[PDB]
């Protein structure tokens, strides 16, 4: 009995990485930075990586190789603005989910500190 099971398994974080990508999607600075046309499978990779990271399915890295993370946002500039939009729309998709209050907040401590480290830029 992992934390992925006990937090409702894999559709848990479908509605988590579905929640969060609307809340993304629909923000003004967040948006942009996404360069895709179509968020689909930026959604999915995250979706798959949670699940991988929590104890569920390894499908991530067996698609992607490791996660690597501060290196695959590289790319990207992930000030305190940005980082405190990523946890806003987080926030509202961790809310949603209404799991129990232990796991609610591993999770978002998790999410939390995960951000706070993604910042990568020289500010
Ligand atoms: C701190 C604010 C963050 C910003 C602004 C940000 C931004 C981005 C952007 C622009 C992408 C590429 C999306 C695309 O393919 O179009 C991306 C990919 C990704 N992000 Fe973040 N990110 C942040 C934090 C985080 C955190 C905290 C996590 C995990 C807990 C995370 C997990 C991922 C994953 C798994 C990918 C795809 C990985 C892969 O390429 O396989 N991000 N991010």
Same mark, same amino acid.
Do not use: Q, T
């Given at each position: 009995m992992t934390f992925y099971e006990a937090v409702g398994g894999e559709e848990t974080f479908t509605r988590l990485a579905r929640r969060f990508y609307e809340g993304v999607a629909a923000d003004p600075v967040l948006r942009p930075m996404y %360069? #895709? #046309?179509?968020?689909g499978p930026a959604e999915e990779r995250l979706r798959l990586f949670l699940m991988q990271y929590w104890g569920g399915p390894r499908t991530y890295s067996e698609r992607?190789?490791? %996660?690597r993370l501060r290196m695959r946002h590289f790319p990207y500039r992930i000030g305190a603005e940005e980082r405190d939009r990523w946890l806003t729309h987080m926030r509202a998709a961790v809310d949603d989910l209404a799991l129990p209050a232990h796991l609610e907040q591993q999770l978002w401590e998790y999410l939390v500190y995960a951000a706070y480290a993604m910042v990568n830029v020289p500010e």
């Open positions: %360069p #895709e #046309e179509d968020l992607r190789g490791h %996660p």
